[PDB]
Design a protein around this nucleic acid. Structure first.
Ligand code: MG
Ligand code: MG
Lengths: 249, 743, 708
RNA sequence: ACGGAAAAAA
RNA sequence: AGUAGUAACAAGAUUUUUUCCGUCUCUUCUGCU
């Protein structure tokens, strides 16, 4: 099975320049060459998106889209064109192609958005089943305190949660770092049972477990409760002269 | 009636309407042309506030160097840079005495972090002067070029991965009599344009390799390149910023790390805190200082700015501060932290890219570089530039100006904060034993001073004492911009305290609008910016609703995604109209797909695809969140073709990237980036965590990939995933790759 | 030593030992016996792991060469540390074996056990019990060999065969005899037993270090010893006694009844520099436009031009003094002729000589490199002169008075919101409806939408039509009080040749705007303009139907991508007004403990001072205050300049000094004359900066009258 | 961990 | 001419701290009720 990447490595080591680079650069030096660039880095993207959507082809998708969508819409809109190049791997794409995929593309049965972004669905279910009280008007004595914008796991700190995520998602690249805690192993086995035969990317699973398990803390002006369900609705519950009485679900 | 908006200050206090004093709705002032004149202004202002010092010729670079410290005392209120060494050492000694065990823990944290820091910590700066090319580059490519020119000249200590070994190579590279670099050139060729029939010059960029001299390499290593700061608010005239090379970039990180560990534990330092944590720390020390004033005592706050900060911060004073903070530490640590003030006391400033010269007879304009302004007759410049060149000509060594006194802007922020906090720490009522005493707050140069005393004469005595003690160390308080009132209102780093820090929404106006990445990312950016300004900067709820409406209007115009029942017409109105007419539950269509606006004050913390998920059609949510969607990138499943699914919607697409320059052929300099990206793309086939976390190791990439291939083939053989012929094929291909790397 | 290890070992063993020594940062030259011990450990692990193969059935067979077979052991020692831990993690996540705390040496697949192999020079039992004390807690198989011809495994149960262990013992006895005959045995036997860091200075950097000191010192180590051996003997007071008395911060007391006004500069009157006519603009409107092609700018332009048919021949009424005015007249005639017969969506104009002059084509000198410009005897520098000073005129105060006024058209239409569920959302909706009732019909909203349309269409034409001369009509769309749409045309913009690559590159354009204002009444406002007289209009007032001449203001202007970007984002001005105004509405709501939105808006009491009259200070309501702050933000965005940034930043300190005086906080300055010179430096020629300076002087006089 | 945006201070 | 302001365009090649967001990848079009 792993003969394909080994033949890719042999083909890339047959060339003398890539062999010189792969034999002289270390694993530590690869970060110095992964961020290497020589062209002019494009700045001010807001203005470029202002004038670039006036162009007919502002999106550069992969070449496989030439087999996924037609070249013309029902109204005759040219959805994609080739690039003026003697190669492959890129095509210029109209936003009518995005609307065509959203109105006439293949309907999937499996979607991964309720699972990967389940924290925002939890916040939506807290907001929907909430309870609003009356508005009191008085001078808010707001004190900037450190509060949890993400609660995390109750049995894990930030470092222990990141160690649990590294043991779950990327277990053969953890180095000589073993989790000493005993809830780390239980949460690791629970997540490994939950994430077997996973069809999504490993970094997507790692970021899902990062927004689930790792707690984040910020300094925010708090007038009232400091629980993690009240920091997420801090813009709604308080202002400068008013207080919204809110109870989550 | 003549309308006057200032008269609202007759009823409303000024700090309660200070957002009207910030004109942050128009374009900030940009700088045209070259930063040569501002660089020569900085050099002349540095050597004119220090002109009574000792001039010496450097034995290594041949440059004229000014030594103004321990010089004559200042005799006027002008900005002077004659800092006394013993006063600086007494202030640092009193700072160590009033904070017991402060320098030891900071030096020990720097000891622990020096052993653990790697070379790619230097790929964190924004841009970097590349001495190999004499050009500004990003930090990663400048570090890569420095490492390649070092290890192609025998300096191969940086192959160990540590930053301190790269710094040993940096210090040892000054011994080479002929450093051989990899420069760039161009080939101009007059080819006609095929759309205007006008003769252009197709300059083609290519790689050249030439040898330097020892003095030329030492000039290029101590060179601070210069440019002009753009889009700066609050200033009528522009100024030059500078960037150091890759030799000085390494030691500056360690000195800044030490001074940051010091500045984190000082109660008077406004660095490195920011935002609401800085405001809470500032308010806590104001509450602590106002509770020290007795029932019969006067307290007065100075809002203070310092005039010409970097023109008077001498690097030898910072050398004394580094050697006094690190007293008791091992000598290698003191030398490693002391390299950077030595490299900044011997620095040269690159003078930009010359000027532009206009022949009125031939109707010509030409960019004359800064290295060519020495053999030009002075009749061609204007009078300001002629005065600047006549004042700067005796400092020019190899196209750069000598800048031994003073600093450039933003170099040592934390160490200067340490010096200012030491001056603030002098005036305790137990150290002084006088009638006046002070405390305060210190940024890089901005400060707020609180002087308590029994009478206003004692307040004036304390102000004079603080001013003259700042003058002893080269800190010149701006008398034009500092002002003193009673305690209760002041300003510090554009934070206005009027019995509590008042809000300022006008400073956060350019963060509104469509950010310009894609559809869903800009929706999240807009709603999070409105929510953040509701929380922090006190954006009111009705103005927040109007900000939601203005963002939705600008977002619907920007991505041409107006509502499906509109009468407007764009390039994508027919597809959005078809999607609007064929959708049963139209309240689940996204704004990027011509749906309604779902946002209000209660749901700014919820993304758009989540908030509309209960209202989406099954067909629409199947097509929108399709895992086979082609607009995003899919990763291939590794050995542990078949690609992974996609979670993002169809609105997380990639916009087109333009990188071509006018008449420029850059296929010689981009092929290195292409081969580097090929090697980094094939490395992740064997190590899938190299994008989540940075991989470590001292072995090469090829040895790591062959070892991972062999151990994965053996695990797949012994676990029952592959066959024996697969294992034999992988091991024989690894043997063939080893035989290719041998011979 | 070192050469014995380079003689009596295989070169691959030396390569593995060198790669494992360089991982710790120690050369074999500084430690030769450690290099010999590492090479001996490597060779013993290699002789343990080699020539042991597992067949297809599973039985471990010993082969003489590598004849399809797999190795029995996995070698862990000799690799990199991260490579070895990757191998250990791959093994431990295939079986159920717990991870070893330390790196082992081999791994036997036949018994599934990690193997630690130590090669000692003491007795084997001593190093065995030392390793068992070091590895107490984990199940790692140990196998210690020594140079004494004896071994010791764990529980004396050897898993390797007898022949390979006999070869190991014979090789170690050969190495012991070779170390005896080289006189190196007891040195290597007593070579056992972390290092420190070091950072020395090379002589070039030492000579740089000697020249980076205070001028009394000549060596870096001398200054280092001085700083390490320094105690304070009162150096600060000793230096303060020697400093002159003329270095002091003498607090002069601040009183705004004693300070002076700002000195506005003296010269010619300030000129209109906006991108369009603000108060003088006359629009041609269509009410409910239902023509074929509604939405397209040129179709709406022609449909608005069809509403006015009083086109007489255009004559130059007010000349541009520095420019050829017949070129402007021919530009307008070419524009009208090309409008009256065209097809398509866009109108690109023919590049005629008068239009080339008006758009500045060919005015740039040709750019060459200095290598091809070496014998040019006329190369003089660019002129970097400061701007000329200008005097304040009354037209900018007239513009700001007209820009705060209500009109009969809803100029800004806000998009829909979500459902209001929370009670604070209903409160904010009521306050937002009050804000939109007071703010949408303002002249500043018309200027916002005019600037947004002009900068958007100018940016699109600049980025898609870089060569052609695009005609961009000045179109806005509004809704009157009847609830019906209206499309207004203010004139046209002929775009230049916009090949802008830098951020500050200027695209020139020509603005031709319709108006009814005579340029001879206030001619100093119109220096940069050429004004024609293009028509006559029957203006019908309440009494008379008069024939007012319709003029056309033609001028050459220019912009850049940054100015167009900040022109497109002018609707955030609506934030900067209303967030201020709501905060005042919030402030009283903290004192009255109720919702003070409706008492502020409905109960019109004229609470806030917003005007100066010949009578005195005039007061208006909160809606007038919101319109005034909206017009202030609009004029800050339109007339943005570095002079405005400098003036606002420097006058903020004087406003804060006046506020500190009014709080009875006893304000004091150190150099008020220098602060006044810093404020008055930024008042040069911008009309908005001059108007804000006059506003500051009027506010100063109002403060001085308020303390009497 | 990479990249982008805004602000502050020189 | 004009933009503009200490110097450029008028075609020819991003220094330090904090906050927030995102994640693997090179042609003829200008329409904000
Ligand atoms: Mg200040
Ligand atoms: Mg300053």
């Amino acid at each position: 099975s792993g003969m394909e990447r080994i033949k890719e490595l042999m083909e890339m080591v047959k060339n003398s320049r890539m062999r010189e680079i792969l034999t002289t650069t270390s694993v530590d030096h690869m970060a110095v060459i992964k961020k290497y660039t020589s062209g002019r880095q494009e700045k001010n993207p807001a203005l470029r998106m202002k004038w670039m959507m006036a162009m007919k082809y502002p999106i550069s998708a992969s070449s496989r889209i030439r087999e996924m969508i037609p070249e013309k819409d029902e109204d005759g809109n040219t959805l994609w064109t080739n690039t003026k190049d003697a190669g492959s791997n890129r095509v210029l794409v109209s936003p009518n192609a995005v609307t065509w995929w959203n109105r006439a593309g293949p309907v999937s049965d499996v979607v991964h958005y309720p699972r990967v972004y389940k924290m925002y669905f939890d916040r939506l279910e807290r907001l929907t089943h909430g309870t609003f009280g009356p508005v009191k008007f008085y001078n808010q004595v707001k004190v900037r305190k450190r509060v949890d914008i993400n609660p995390g796991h109750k049995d894990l700190t930030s470092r222990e949660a990141q160690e649990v995520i590294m043991e779950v998602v990327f277990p053969n690249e953890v180095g000589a770092r073993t989790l000493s805690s005993d809830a780390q192993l239980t949460i690791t086995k629970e997540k490994k049972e939950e994430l077997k035969n996973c069809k999504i990317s490993p970094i997507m699973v790692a970021y899902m477990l990062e927004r689930e398990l790792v707690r984040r803390t910020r300094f925010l002006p708090i007038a009232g409760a400091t629980s993690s369900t009240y920091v997420e609705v801090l813009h709604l519950t308080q202002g400068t002269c008013w207080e919204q009485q809110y109870t989550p679900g | 009636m003549d309308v006057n908006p200032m008269l609202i200050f007759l009823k409303v206090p000024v700090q309660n309407a200070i957002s009207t004093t910030f004109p942050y709705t128009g374009d900030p002032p940009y700088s045209h042309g070259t930063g040569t004149g501002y660089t020569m202004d900085t050099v002349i202002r540095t050597h004119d506030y220090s002109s009574r010092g000792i001039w010496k010729t450097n034995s290594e670079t041949g440059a004229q160097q000014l030594n103004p410290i321990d010089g004559p005392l200042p005799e006027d209120n002008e900005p002077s840079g004659y800092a006394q060494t013993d006063c600086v050492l007494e202030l640092i000694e009193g700072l160590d005495r009033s904070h017991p065990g402060l320098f030891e823990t900071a030096c020990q944290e720097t000891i622990d972090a020096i052993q653990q820091t790697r070379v790619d910590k230097l790929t964190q700066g924004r841009q970097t002067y590349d001495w190999t090319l004499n050009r500004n580059q990003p930090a990663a490519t400048a570090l890569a070029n420095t490492i390649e020119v070092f290890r192609k000249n025998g300096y191969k200590l940086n192959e160990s991965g540590r930053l301190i070994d790269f710094l040993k190579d940096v210090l040892l590279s000054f011994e080479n009599d002929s450093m051989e670099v990899t420069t760039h050139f161009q080939k101009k060729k007059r080819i006609r344009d095929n759309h205007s029939k006008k003769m252009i010059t197709q300059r083609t960029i290519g790689k050249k390799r030439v040898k330097l001299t020892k003095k030329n390499y030492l000039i290029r290593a101590l060179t601070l390149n210069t440019m002009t700061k753009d889009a700066e608010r609050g200033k009528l005239k522009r100024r030059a910023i500078a960037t150091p090379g890759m030799q000085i970039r390494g030691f500056v990180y360690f000195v800044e790390l030490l001074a940051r560990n010091i500045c984190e534990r000082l109660e008077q330092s406004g660095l490195p805190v920011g935002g609401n944590e800085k405001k809470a720390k500032l308010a806590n020390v104001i509450k602590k200082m106002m509770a020290k004033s007795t029932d019969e005592e006067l307290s007065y706050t100075i809002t203070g700015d310092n005039t010409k900060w970097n023109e008077n911060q001498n690097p030898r004073i910072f050398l004394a501060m580094v050697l006094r903070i690190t007293a008791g530490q091992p000598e290698w640590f003191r030398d490693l932290l002391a390299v950077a003030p030595i490299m900044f006391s011997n620095k040269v400033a690159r003078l930009g890219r010359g000027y532009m010269f206009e022949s009125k007879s031939m109707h010509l304009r030409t960019q004359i570089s800064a290295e060519n302004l020495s053999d030009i007759n002075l009749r061609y410049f204007n009078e300001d530039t002629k005065k600047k060149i006549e004042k700067i000509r005796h400092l020019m060594v190899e196209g750069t100006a000598s800048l031994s006194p003073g600093m450039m802007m933003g170099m040592f922020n934390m160490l200067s904060t340490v010096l200012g906090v030491s001056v603030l720490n002098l005036g305790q009522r137990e150290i002084l034993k006088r009638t006046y005493w002070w405390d305060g707050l210190q940024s890089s140069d901005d400060f707020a001073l609180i002087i308590n005393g029994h009478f206003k004469e004692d307040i004036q005595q304390g102000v004079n004492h603080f001013y003259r003690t700042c003058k002893l160390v080269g800190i010149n308080m701006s008398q034009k911009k500092s002002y003193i009132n009673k305690t209760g209102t002041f300003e510090f780093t554009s934070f206005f305290y009027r019995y509590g820090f008042v809000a300022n929404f006008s400073m956060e106006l350019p963060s509104f609008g469509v950010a310009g990445n894609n559809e869903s990312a800009d929706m999240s950016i807009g709603t999070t910016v409105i929510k953040t300004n509701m929380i922090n900067n006190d954006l009111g709820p009705a103005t927040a609703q109007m900000a939601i409406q203005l963002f939705i209007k600008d977002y619907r115009y920007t991505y041409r995604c107006h509502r499906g029942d509109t009468n407007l017409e764009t390039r994508r109105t027919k597809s959005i109209k078809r999607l609007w007419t064929e959708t049963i539950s139209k309240a689940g269509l996204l704004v990027a797909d011509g749906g309604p606006n779902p946002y209000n004050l209660r749901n700014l913390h919820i993304p758009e695809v989540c908030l509309k998920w209960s209202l989406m059609d099954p067909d629409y949510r199947g097509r929108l969140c399709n895992p086979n969607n082609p607009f995003v990138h899919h990763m291939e499943v590794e050995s542990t073709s078949l690609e992974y699914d996609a979670v993002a919607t169809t609105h997380s697409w990639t916009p087109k990237r333009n990188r071509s320059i006018l008449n420029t052929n850059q296929r010689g300099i981009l092929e290195d980036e292409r081969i580097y990206q090929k090697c980094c793309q094939v490395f992740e086939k064997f190590f899938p965590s190299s994008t989540y976390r940075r991989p470590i190791g001292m072995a090469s990439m090829l040895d790591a990939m062959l070892s991972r291939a062999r151990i994965d083939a053996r695990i797949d053989l012994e676990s029952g995933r592959i066959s024996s012929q697969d294992f034999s094929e992988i091991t024989n291909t690894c043997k063939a790759i080893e035989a290719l790397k041998r011979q | 030593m070192e050469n014995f290890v380079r003689t009596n070992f295989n070169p691959m063993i030396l390569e593995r030992a060198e790669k494992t020594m360089k991982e710790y940062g120690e050369n074999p030259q500084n430690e030769g016996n450690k290099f010999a011990a590492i090479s001996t450990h490597m060779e013993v692990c290699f002789m343990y792991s080699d020539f042991h193969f597992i067949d297809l059935e599973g039985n471990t067979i010993v082969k003489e060469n590598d004849d399809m077979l797999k190795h029995r052991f996995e070698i862990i020692e000799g690799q990199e540390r991260n490579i070895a831990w990757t191998i250990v993690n791959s093994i431990c996540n295939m079986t159920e074996n717990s991870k070893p705390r330390f790196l082992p040496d081999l791994y036997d697949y036949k018994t599934n056990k990690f193997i630690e192999i130590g090669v000692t020079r003491r007795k084997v039992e001593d190093y065995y019990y030392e390793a068992a004390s070091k590895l107490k807690g984990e199940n790692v198989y140990i196998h210690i060999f020594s140079f004494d011809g004896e071994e010791m495994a764990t529980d004396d149960e050897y898993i390797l065969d007898e022949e390979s262990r006999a070869r190991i013992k014979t090789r170690l006895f050969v190495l012991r005899q070779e170390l005896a005959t080289a006189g190196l045995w007891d040195s290597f036997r007593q070579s056992e037993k972390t290092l420190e860091e070091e950072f020395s200075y090379p002589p070039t950097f030492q000579r740089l270090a000697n020249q980076s000191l205070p001028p009394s010192f000549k060596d870096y180590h001398q200054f280092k010893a001085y700083v390490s051996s320094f105690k304070a003997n009162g150096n600060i007071e000793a230096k303060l006694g020697a400093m002159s008395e003329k270095v002091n911060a003498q607090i002069e007391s601040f009183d705004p009844r004693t300070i002076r006004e700002l000195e506005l500069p003296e010269g010619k009157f300030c000129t209109q520099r906006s991108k369009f006519l603000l108060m003088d603009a006359m629009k041609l409107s269509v009410l409910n436009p239902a023509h074929e092609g509604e939405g397209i700018p040129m179709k709406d332009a022609k449909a608005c031009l069809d509403t006015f048919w009083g086109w007489k021949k255009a004559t130059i009424i007010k000349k541009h003094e520095k420019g050829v005015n017949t070129n402007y007249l021919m530009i307008w005639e070419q524009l009208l002729e090309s409008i009256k017969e065209m097809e398509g969506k866009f109108l690109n104009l023919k590049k005629t000589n008068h239009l080339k002059w008006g758009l500045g084509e060919g005015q740039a000198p040709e750019k060459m490199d200095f290598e091809d410009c070496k014998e040019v005897p006329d190369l003089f520098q660019y002129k970097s002169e400061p701007p000329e000073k200008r005097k304040l005129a009354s037209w900018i105060q007239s513009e700001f008075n007209k820009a705060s006024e209500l009109t009969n058209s809803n100029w800004i239409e806000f998009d829909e919101l979500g459902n209001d569920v929370a009670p604070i959302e209903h409160i904010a909706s009521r306050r937002r409806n009050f804000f939109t009732a007071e703010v949408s019909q303002c002249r500043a909203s018309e200027y916002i939408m005019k600037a947004v349309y002009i900068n958007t269409a100018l940016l699109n034409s600049s980025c898609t039509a870089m060569e052609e001369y695009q005609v961009i009509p000045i179109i806005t769309k509004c809704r009157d009080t009847s609830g019906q749409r209206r499309t207004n045309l203010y004139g046209f913009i002929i775009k230049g040749r916009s090949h802008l690559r830098n951020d500050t590159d200027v695209v020139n354009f020509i603005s031709l705007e319709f108006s009814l204002t005579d340029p001879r009444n206030e001619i100093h406002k119109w220096e940069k303009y050429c004004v024609l007289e293009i028509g006559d209009m029957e203006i019908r007032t309440s009494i008379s139907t008069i024939m007012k001449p319709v003029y056309l203001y033609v001028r050459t202007n220019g912009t850049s991508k940054i100015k167009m970007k900040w022109g497109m984002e002018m609707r955030r001005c609506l934030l900067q007004s209303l967030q201020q105004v709501e905060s005042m509405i919030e402030a009283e709501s903290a004192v009255k403990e109720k919702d003070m939105t409706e008492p502020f808006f409905r109960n019109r009491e004229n609470d806030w001072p917003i005007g100066e009259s010949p009578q005195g200070i005039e007061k208006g309501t909160i809606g007038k205050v919101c319109r005034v702050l909206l017009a202030k933000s609009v004029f800050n965005s339109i007339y943005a300049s570095a002079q405005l940034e400098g003036f606002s930043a420097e006058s903020r300190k004087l406003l804060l000094l006046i506020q500190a005086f009014r709080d009875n906080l006893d304000p004091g300055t150190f150099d008020l004359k220098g602060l006044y010179e810093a404020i008055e430096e930024c008042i040069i020629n911008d009309p908005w900066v001059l108007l804000n300076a006059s506003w500051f002087n009027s506010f100063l006089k109002a403060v001085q009258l308020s303390m009497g």
